Amino acid sequence: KSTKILILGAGPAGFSAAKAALGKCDDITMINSEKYLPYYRPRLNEIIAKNKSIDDILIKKNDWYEKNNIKVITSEFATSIDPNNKLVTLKSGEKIKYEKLIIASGSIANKIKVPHADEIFSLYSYDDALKIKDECKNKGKAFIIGGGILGIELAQAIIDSGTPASIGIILEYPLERQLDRDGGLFLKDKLDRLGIKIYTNSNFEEMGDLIRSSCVITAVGVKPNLDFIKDTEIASKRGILVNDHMETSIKDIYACGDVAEFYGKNPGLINIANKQGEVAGLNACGEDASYSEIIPSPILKVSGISIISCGDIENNKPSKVFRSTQEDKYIVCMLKENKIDAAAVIGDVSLGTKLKKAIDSSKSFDNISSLDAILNNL
Numbered sequence: 001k002s003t004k005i006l007i008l009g010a011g012p013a014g015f016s017a018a019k020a021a022l023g024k025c026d027d028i029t030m031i032n033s034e035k036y037l038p039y040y041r042p043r044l045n046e047i048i049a050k051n052k053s054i055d056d057i058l059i060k061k062n063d064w065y066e067k068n069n070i071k072v073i074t075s076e077f078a079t080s081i082d083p084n085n086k087l088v089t090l091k092s093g094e095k096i097k098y099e100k101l102i103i104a105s106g107s108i109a110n111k112i113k114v115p116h117a118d119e120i121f122s123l124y125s126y127d128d129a130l131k132i133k134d135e136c137k138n139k140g141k142a143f144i145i146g147g148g149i150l151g152i153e154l155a156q157a158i159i160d161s162g163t164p165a166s167i168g169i170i171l172e173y174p175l176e177r178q179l180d181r182d183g184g185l186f187l188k189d190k191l192d193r194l195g196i197k198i199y200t201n202s203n204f205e206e207m208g209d210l211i212r213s214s215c216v217i218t219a220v221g222v223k224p225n226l227d228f229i230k231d232t233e234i235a236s237k238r239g240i241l242v243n244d245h246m247e248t249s250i251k252d253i254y255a256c257g258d259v260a261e262f263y264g265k266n267p268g269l270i271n272i273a274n275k276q277g278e279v280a281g282l283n284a285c286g287e288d289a290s291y292s293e294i295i296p297s298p299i300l301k302v303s304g305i306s307i308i309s310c311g312d313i314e315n316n317k318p319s320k321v322f323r324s325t326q327e328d329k330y331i332v333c334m335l336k337e338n339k340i341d342a343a344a345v346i347g348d349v350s351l352g353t354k355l356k357k358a359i360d361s362s363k364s365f366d367n368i369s370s371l372d373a374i375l376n377n378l
């Protein structure tokens with residue numbers, strides 16, 4: 001088999017490339033390791049929370065790919081790329097020739113060892129969600145290891161489905177990449193009075209009884225899924241390195257979405273997948289579109305508590321810090337001279353957005369004597 005445009009991976013990024021290539025190129029093939037068409041992966045929590053199926057989260061149904069003549073090979077996994085012969089080798093041993101290759105292979109969950117746990121689950125795929133659904137009914141409760149957004153959202157989804165759940169983290173407070181200590185503890189409190197318990201400073205060896213009796217899910221982050229490039233000269237660091245055209249180190253090979261690293265950024269967000277996938281498809285069909293960095297992200301969809309975080313909060317060495325704790329909201333604002341370098345707000349997206357804009361536009365503040373004076377100049 002041989003095609004014009006070969007798309008390696010059929011998630012949101014791959015889908016967006018196919019859609020972009022439509023009308024412009026007339027021979028498009030998508031390879032996907034899963035047995036499902038491209039689906040809106042961030043809604044996996046709804047499979048758990050609302051008992052929705054794959055059909056409810058698919059981006060396009062079968063008929064769309066047929067009407068548009070896009071060929072999807074499901075349950076097939078690329079293992080090798082031969083760039084000079086333009087051949088991709090699959091798990092079966094079958095080879096596919098391409099004129100252009102778009103790598104859209106997304107991410108893979110970080111795997112950690114958890115003491116006392118026979119089976120460790122993580123939530124990446126639709127099949128993952130189902131496995132979690134069933135163990136939660138089987139065990140009767142869940143224990144989520146990992147201090148991030150996804151771990152918290154999953155806990156609520158599992159609560160919503162009708163199963164108790166709590167979280168275990170190794171640090172003192174959750175969300176340490178997005179929040180300072182006081183921010184995280186503010187969040188922990190709000191989550192704890194909402195029935196989402198977080199075990200802090202955990203030693204999992206000492207949590208045998210809970211671990212044993214729970215469905216254990218690790219939510220410890222994700223990395224670009226790119227082992228199949230190992231023998232090639234395709235440049236990578238964390239992700240596959242791409243320019244603004246989504247072109248890799250190697251001619252006629254592109255990458256986009258979760259697998260791709262653009263000016264050192266690999267944020268792992270769906271709007272980036274959609275937009276990078278689009279640019280890749282367009283370029284693969286000979287239209288020299290440029291991706292520009294977009295990215296805001298209002299987190300998180302959890303327990304009706306909203307968070308926006310901007311800049312390097314975790315390791316910030318600011319000249320000045322302004323903090324506000326209220327009943328409904330938490331604000332932290334970190335200065336570098338007369339500029340806001342980093343900020344996070346819990347419970348006021350309107351304010352977080354103003355701080356975001358100030359940071360992004362690099363607004364200078366001639367008055368830094370008080371938080372009030374900064375707020376008035378946003």
Ligand SMILES: Cc1cc2nc3c(=O)[nH]c(=O)nc-3n(C[C@H](O)[C@H](O)[C@H](O)COP(=O)(O)OP(=O)(O)OC[C@H]3O[C@@H](n4cnc5c(N)ncnc54)[C@H](O)[C@@H]3O)c2cc1C
Pocket residue numbers: 008009010011012013014031032033034040041042043044045076077078079104105106107123124125150225228256257258259268269270271273
């Ligand atoms: C539970 C969960 C919640 C999320 N919530 C949010 C959110 O709120 N906001 C947000 O912005 N993002 C969220 N995300 C992330 C979002 O889903 C991703 O950014 C987006 O799916 C990336 O799309 P992608 O096409 O680059 O990668 P993927 O969605 O991972 O798709 C890549 C596809 O390629 C396949 N593949 C991998 N290797 C091969 C290979 N060797 N050969 C052939 N096929 C291969 C994979 O099976 C996969 O189907 C969430 C993710 C998860 C898992």
